[PDB]
Structures are given as structure tokens and as C-alpha cells.
Coordinates of C-alpha atoms and ligand atoms in Angstrom, one line a residue:
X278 CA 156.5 127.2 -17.3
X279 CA 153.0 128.2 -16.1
X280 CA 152.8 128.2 -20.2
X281 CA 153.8 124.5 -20.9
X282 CA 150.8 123.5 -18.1
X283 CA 148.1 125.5 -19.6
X284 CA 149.0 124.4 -23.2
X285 CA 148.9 120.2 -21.7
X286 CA 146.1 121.3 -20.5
X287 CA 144.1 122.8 -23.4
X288 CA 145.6 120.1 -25.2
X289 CA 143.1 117.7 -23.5
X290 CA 140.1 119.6 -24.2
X291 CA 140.5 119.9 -28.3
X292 CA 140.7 117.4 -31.0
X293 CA 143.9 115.9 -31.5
X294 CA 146.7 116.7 -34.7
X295 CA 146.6 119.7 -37.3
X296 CA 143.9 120.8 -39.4
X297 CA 146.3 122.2 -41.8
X298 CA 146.8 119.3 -43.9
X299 CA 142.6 119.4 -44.6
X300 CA 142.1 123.9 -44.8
X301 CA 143.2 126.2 -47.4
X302 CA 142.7 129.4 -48.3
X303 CA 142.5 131.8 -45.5
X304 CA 140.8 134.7 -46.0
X305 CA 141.3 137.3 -43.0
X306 CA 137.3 139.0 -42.2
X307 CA 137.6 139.9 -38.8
X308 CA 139.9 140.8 -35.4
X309 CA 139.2 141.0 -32.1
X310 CA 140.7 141.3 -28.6
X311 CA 141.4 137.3 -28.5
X312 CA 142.8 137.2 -31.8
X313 CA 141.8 137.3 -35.7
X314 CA 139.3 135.6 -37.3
X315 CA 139.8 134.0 -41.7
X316 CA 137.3 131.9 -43.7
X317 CA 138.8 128.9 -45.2
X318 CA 137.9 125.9 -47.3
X319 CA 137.6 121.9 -46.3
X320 CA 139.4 120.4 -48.9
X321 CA 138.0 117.6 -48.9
X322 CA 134.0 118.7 -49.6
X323 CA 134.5 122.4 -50.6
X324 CA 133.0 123.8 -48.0
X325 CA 134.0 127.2 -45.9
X326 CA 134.1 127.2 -42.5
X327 CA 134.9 130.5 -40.0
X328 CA 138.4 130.1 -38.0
X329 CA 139.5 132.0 -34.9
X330 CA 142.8 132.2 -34.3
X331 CA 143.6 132.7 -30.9
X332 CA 147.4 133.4 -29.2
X333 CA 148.3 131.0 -26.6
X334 CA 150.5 133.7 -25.1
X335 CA 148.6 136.7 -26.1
X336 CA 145.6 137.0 -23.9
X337 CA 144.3 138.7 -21.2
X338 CA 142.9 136.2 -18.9
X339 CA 144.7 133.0 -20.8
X340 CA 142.0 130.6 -19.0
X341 CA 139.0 132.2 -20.5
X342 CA 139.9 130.1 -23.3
X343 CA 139.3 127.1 -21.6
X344 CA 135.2 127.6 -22.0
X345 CA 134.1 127.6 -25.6
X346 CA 135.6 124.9 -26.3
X347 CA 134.2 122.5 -23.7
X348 CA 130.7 124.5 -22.9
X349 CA 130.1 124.6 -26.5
X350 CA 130.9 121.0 -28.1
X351 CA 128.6 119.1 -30.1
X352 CA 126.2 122.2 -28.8
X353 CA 123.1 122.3 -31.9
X354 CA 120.7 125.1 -32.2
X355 CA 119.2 126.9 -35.5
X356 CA 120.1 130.2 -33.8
X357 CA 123.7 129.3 -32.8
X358 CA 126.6 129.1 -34.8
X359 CA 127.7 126.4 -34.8
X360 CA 131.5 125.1 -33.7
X361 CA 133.0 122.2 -35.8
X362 CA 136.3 121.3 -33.8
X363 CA 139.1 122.7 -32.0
X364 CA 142.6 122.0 -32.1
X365 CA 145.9 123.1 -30.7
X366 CA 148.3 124.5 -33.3
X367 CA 151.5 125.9 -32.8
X368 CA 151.3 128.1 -29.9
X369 CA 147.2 128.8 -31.1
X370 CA 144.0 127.9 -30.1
X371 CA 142.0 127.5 -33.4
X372 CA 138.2 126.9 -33.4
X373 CA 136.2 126.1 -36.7
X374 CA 133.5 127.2 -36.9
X375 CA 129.6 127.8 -39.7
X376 CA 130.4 130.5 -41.9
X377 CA 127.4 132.8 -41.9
X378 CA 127.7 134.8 -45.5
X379 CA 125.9 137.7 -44.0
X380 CA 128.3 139.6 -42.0
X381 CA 127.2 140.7 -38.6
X382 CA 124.5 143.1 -37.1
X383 CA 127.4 146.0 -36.7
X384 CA 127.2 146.8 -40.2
X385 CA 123.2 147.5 -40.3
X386 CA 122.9 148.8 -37.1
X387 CA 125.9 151.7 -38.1
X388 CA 124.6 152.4 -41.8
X389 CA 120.4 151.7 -41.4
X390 CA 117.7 152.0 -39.4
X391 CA 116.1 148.9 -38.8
X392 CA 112.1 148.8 -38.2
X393 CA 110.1 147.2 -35.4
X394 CA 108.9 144.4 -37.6
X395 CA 112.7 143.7 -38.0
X396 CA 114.1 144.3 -34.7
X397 CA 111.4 142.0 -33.3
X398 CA 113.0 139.2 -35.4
X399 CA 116.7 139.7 -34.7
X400 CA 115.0 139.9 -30.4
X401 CA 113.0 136.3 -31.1
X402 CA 115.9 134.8 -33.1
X403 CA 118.5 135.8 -29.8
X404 CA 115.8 134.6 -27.5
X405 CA 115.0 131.6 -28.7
X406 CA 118.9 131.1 -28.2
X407 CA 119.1 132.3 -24.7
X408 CA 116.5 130.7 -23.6
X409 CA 117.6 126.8 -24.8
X410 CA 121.4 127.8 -23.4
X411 CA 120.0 129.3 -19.9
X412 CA 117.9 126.5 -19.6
X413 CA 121.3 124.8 -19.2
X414 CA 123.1 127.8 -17.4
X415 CA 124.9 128.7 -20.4
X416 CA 126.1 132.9 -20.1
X417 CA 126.9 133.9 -23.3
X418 CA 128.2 137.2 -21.8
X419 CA 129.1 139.3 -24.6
X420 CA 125.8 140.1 -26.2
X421 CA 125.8 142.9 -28.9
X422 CA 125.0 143.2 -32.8
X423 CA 128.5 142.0 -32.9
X424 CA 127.8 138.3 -31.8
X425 CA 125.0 138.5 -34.0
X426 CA 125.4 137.2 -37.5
X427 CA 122.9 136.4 -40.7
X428 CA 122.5 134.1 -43.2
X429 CA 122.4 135.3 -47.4
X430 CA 118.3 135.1 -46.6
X431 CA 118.2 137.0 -43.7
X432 CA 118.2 133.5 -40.8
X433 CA 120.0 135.4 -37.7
X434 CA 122.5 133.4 -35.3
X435 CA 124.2 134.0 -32.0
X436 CA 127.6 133.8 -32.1
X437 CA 131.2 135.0 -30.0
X438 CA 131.2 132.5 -27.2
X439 CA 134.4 133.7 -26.7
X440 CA 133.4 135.3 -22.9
X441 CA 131.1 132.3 -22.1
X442 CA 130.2 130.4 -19.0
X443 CA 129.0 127.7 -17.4
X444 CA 126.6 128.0 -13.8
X445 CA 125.6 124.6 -11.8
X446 CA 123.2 123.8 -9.0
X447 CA 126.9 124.2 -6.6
X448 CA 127.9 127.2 -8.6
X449 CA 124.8 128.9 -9.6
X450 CA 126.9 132.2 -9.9
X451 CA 129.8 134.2 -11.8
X452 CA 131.8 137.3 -10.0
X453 CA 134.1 137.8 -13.7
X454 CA 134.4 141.2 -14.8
X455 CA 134.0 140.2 -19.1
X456 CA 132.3 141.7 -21.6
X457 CA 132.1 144.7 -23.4
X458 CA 132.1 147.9 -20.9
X459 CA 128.8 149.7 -22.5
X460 CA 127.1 146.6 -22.8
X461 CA 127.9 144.9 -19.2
X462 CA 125.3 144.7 -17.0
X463 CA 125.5 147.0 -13.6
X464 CA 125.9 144.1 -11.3
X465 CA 128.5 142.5 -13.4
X466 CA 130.5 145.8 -13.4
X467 CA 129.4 145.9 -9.9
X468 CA 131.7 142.8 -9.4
X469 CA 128.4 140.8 -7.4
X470 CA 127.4 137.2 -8.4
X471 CA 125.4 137.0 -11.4
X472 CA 123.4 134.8 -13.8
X473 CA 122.1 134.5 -17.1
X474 CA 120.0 137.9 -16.7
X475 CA 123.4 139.8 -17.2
X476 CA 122.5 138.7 -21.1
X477 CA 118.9 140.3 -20.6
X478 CA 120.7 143.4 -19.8
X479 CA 123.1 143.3 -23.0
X480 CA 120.6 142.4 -25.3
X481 CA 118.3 145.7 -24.5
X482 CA 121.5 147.7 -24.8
X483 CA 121.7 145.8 -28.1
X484 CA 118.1 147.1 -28.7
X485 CA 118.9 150.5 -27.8
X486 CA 121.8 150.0 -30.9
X487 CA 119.0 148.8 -33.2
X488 CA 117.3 151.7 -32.5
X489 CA 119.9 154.4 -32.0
X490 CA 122.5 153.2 -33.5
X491 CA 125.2 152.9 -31.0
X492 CA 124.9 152.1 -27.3
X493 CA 124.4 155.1 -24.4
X494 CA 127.8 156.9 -23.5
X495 CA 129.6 155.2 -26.4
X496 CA 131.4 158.6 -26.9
X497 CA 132.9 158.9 -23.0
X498 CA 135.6 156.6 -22.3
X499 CA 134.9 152.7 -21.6
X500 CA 136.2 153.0 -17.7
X501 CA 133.9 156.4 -17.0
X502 CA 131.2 154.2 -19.4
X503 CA 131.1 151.2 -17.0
X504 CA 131.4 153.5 -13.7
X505 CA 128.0 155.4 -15.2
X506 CA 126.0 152.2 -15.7
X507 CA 126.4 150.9 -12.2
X508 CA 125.7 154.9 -10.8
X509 CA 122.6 155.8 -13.0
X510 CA 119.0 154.6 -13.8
X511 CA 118.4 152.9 -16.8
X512 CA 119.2 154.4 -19.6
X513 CA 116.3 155.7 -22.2
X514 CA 116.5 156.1 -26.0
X515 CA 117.7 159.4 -28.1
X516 CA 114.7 158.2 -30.2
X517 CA 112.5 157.4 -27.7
X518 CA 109.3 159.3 -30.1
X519 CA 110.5 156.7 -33.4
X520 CA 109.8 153.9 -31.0
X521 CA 106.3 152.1 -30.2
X522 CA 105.3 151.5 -27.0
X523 CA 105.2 147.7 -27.7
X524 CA 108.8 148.4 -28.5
X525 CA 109.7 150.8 -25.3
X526 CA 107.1 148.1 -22.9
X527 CA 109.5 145.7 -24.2
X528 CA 112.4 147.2 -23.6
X529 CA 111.3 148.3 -19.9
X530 CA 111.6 144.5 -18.8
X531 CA 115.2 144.1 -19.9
X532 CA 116.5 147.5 -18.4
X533 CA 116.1 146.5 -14.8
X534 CA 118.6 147.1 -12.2
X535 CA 117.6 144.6 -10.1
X536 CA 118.5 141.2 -12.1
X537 CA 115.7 139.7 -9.8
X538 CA 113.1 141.7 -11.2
X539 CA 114.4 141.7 -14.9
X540 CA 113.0 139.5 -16.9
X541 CA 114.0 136.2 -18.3
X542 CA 114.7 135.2 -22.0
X543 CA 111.6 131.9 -21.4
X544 CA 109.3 135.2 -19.7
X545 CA 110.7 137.4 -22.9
X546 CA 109.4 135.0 -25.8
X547 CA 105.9 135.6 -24.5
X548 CA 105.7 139.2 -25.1
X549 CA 103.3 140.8 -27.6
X550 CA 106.2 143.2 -29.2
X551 CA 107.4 140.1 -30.6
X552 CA 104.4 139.1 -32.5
X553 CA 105.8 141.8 -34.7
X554 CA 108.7 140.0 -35.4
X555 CA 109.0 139.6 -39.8
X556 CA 110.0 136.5 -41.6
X557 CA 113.5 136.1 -42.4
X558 CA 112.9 137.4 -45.3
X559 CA 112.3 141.0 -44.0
X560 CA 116.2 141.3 -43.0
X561 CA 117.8 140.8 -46.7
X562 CA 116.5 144.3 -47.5
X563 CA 119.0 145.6 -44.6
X564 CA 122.0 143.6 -45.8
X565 CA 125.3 145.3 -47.6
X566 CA 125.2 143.4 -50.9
X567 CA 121.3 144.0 -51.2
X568 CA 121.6 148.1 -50.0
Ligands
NJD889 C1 135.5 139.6 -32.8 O1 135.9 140.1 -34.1 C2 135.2 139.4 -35.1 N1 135.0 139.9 -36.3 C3 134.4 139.1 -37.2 N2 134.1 139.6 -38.5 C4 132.7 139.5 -38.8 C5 132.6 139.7 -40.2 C6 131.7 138.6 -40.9 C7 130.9 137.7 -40.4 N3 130.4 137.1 -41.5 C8 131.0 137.7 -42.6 C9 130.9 137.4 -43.9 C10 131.6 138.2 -44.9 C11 132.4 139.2 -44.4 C12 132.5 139.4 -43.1 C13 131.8 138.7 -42.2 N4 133.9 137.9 -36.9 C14 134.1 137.4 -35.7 N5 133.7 136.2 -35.3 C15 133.1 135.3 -36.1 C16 132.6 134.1 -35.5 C17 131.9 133.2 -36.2 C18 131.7 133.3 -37.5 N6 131.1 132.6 -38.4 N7 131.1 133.2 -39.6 C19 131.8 134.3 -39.5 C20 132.2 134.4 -38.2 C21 132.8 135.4 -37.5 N8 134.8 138.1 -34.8

């Protein structure tokens, strides 16, 4: 019942029929708490595109799938994978999506140690993307080296939209308790209203990963995680000495409790730690196939 109205209902926000008849070859790369994710090929020009494949009657919070779809349509940045279409299939919500060759920040951040020159351009690539999709209260919400993907030459995009959202003038605020637990921000985990800085927050838990290589508390359990990020005081790096204090000065204005006082991803792309940032071309050296 409650089924049949949500599926008219996503119905109405995807592109009509089957993309079946024009997709072949799925190769499985990924899964996630939504569903899995393949690579196939268009027949018709050779090309690969990503697909996630999400269960209609498998989620947690089935409306959640309601956002991506509409917040990110016809949505264009150099930073931002990009999403081709969406389309109802079986009982599955399907979105096609760039294939970025490189795999996803997870991989160096577990098996390297990136340097400043690099983690200053993975920070300006993400920024450059907050800022465009704040400026149009866009949350991405799920920030990590996960969502972050590369090109063969090194070109980082923001990807996952999965957890998105969408803030107006009339509802400037979210109260939604997504994300991942030792990214989320303390507010969020809080359950108050919050904005876009909840992504501020994430992304210098994604530069403590950079630097340490996994997030703080990752070993305790994600419920006592979240519980210690709303209780305590920002957390500092293990390798606080390895850093600069370009890097740490940097990292100081996203670690803020109070989201008023944290900095924003337009304030962010002025900072001097990212003069550091290296070309593109400074990230191939950190990639699997090149290693
Ligand atoms: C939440 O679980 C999850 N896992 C994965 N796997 C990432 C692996 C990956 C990303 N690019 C790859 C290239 C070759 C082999 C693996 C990869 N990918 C995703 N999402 C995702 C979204 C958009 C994408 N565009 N291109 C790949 C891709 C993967 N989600």
C-alpha cells in the first residue's frame, strides 16, 4: 500500500521506460547502505557510465530517495559527478551516473600518506564544490574520502548525494539525523537545525583521515562515536607534529562547535593553506595502478 504511493510517486520524478534495452555489461565495483553500485556500457556510443541500484523496499528512511534525484538534475560542475538520468525499474531506483576511472579517496587515504601539497588540492577541489552547491543551499551531508573520487590524471570530484538536501529562504534548516556517525557534525547528532556548515565539519574530519588515516574514535562503536562528538572538544590529530601550521590553522576553522563561528566553504577558498594546493597532476602518484 504505503509502497504502491511512494513508487507513483518516484515515478514522477525520473525519466520515463527502462534503460535496459540501451546498458550492458554490469560490472559490480561498489555497495553501500542504499544499495550496490556496477559500471556499464551505453550501447549506443561505447561509453561507461556508474549505476546505483537502489531497493525500493529495502531502505531505511525510503523518502531519502526522493532528493538526488530532483536536487541534483541537470546539476553541472567540474568537481561534481555528474548524474545522467534516473529511472524506475522493477521495484529499483537506478541513477546513471560519470564513471570516474580512479576509484575513491578510501583507498589512498588507508594505504598512503598523502602530503600538504596534495591534501590542499583534494580541500580546493571539494570547496570549490561546496561552495557553488551552498550558494544554492545544497547539503551534501555525507562528506568523507568516500564521496570523493579521481579521474586517471589525478581531477578530484564530489560525489554520494545519496544523504542530500535542499534548505530555502522558508526552510533555511534541516533537524535529520544522516550521515556517517564519525563524520556527523555535533549539532546534527545533537538533533538541532542545521545548514551547510555541517559539511565544513565533515570535510575537516575528512582532513584528519588525510592525515591520519582514519577518523577519531573509529575503533569505539558508531553509537558511543556520535555520543563523544556532541560531549567533547574538537578533536586534534595523532600526527599533530607531521602537520604544518598552515595545515592545523586550516583545520582550526572547520573544527568549530559552534556552526556560527565555523567557517564557510566561500570564507575557506581564501585561505593561504590552500595556495599549497598541487596540480592535478600531483595525485596520480597516490593512485593504485600507478603505486
Ligand atoms: C557507497 O558505496 C559505493 N562504493 C563505490 N565504489 C567506489 C569504487 C570506485 C569508484 N571508481 C572506481 C573505479 C574502479 C574501481 C572502483 C571504483 N562507489 C560508490 N558510488 C559511486 C558513485 C558514483 C560513481 N561514479 N563512478 C564511480 C562511482 C561510484 N558507492
Amino acid at each position: 500500500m504505503s509502497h504502491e504511493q511512494f513508487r507513483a510517486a518516484l515515478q514522477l520524478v525520473v525519466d520515463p521506460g527502462d534503460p535496459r534495452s540501451y546498458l550492458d555489461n554490469f560490472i559490480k565495483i561498489g555497495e553501500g547502505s542504499t544499495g550496490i553500485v556496477c559500471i556499464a556500457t551505453v550501447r549506443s556510443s561505447g561509453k561507461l557510465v556508474a549505476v546505483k541500484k537502489m531497493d525500493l523496499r529495502k531502505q531505511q528512511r525510503r523518502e531519502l530517495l526522493f532528493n538526488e534525484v530532483v536536487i541534483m538534475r541537470d546539476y553541472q560542475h567540474e568537481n561534481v559527478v555528474e548524474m545522467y538520468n534516473s529511472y524506475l525499474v522493477g521495484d529499483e531506483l537506478w541513477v546513471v551516473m560519470e564513471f570516474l576511472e580512479g576509484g575513491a579517496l578510501t583507498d589512498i587515504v588507508t594505504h598512503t600518506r598523502m602530503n600538504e601539497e596534495q591534501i590542499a588540492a583534494v580541500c580546493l577541489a571539494v570547496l570549490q564544490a561546496l561552495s557553488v552547491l551552498h550558494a544554492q543551499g545544497v547539503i551534501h551531508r555525507d562528506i568523507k574520502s568516500d564521496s570523493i573520487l579521481l579521474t586517471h590524471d589525478g581531477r578530484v570530484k564530489l560525489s554520494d548525494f545519496g544523504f542530500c538536501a535542499q534548505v530555502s529562504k522558508e526552510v533555511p534548516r534541516r533537524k535529520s539525523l544522516v550521515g556517517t556517525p564519525y563524520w556527523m557534525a555535533p549539532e546534527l547528532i545533537s538533533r538541532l537545525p542545521y545548514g551547510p556548515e555541517v559539511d565544513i565539519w565533515s570535510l575537516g574530519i575528512m582532513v584528519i583521515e588525510m592525515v591520519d588515516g582514519e577518523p577519531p574514535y573509529f575503533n569505539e562503536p558508531p553509537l558511543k562515536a556520535m555520543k563523544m562528538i556532541r560531549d567533547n572538544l574538537p578533536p586534534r590529530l595523532k600526527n599533530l607534529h607531521k602537520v604544518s601550521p598552515s595545515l592545523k590553522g586550516f583545520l582550526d576553522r572547520l573544527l568549530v562547535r559552534d556552526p556560527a563561528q565555523r567557517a564557510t566553504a566561500a570564507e575557506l577558498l581564501k585561505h593561504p593553506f590552500l595556495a599549497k594546493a598541487g596540480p592535478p597532476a600531483s595525485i596520480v602518484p597516490l593512485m593504485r595502478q600507478n603505486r
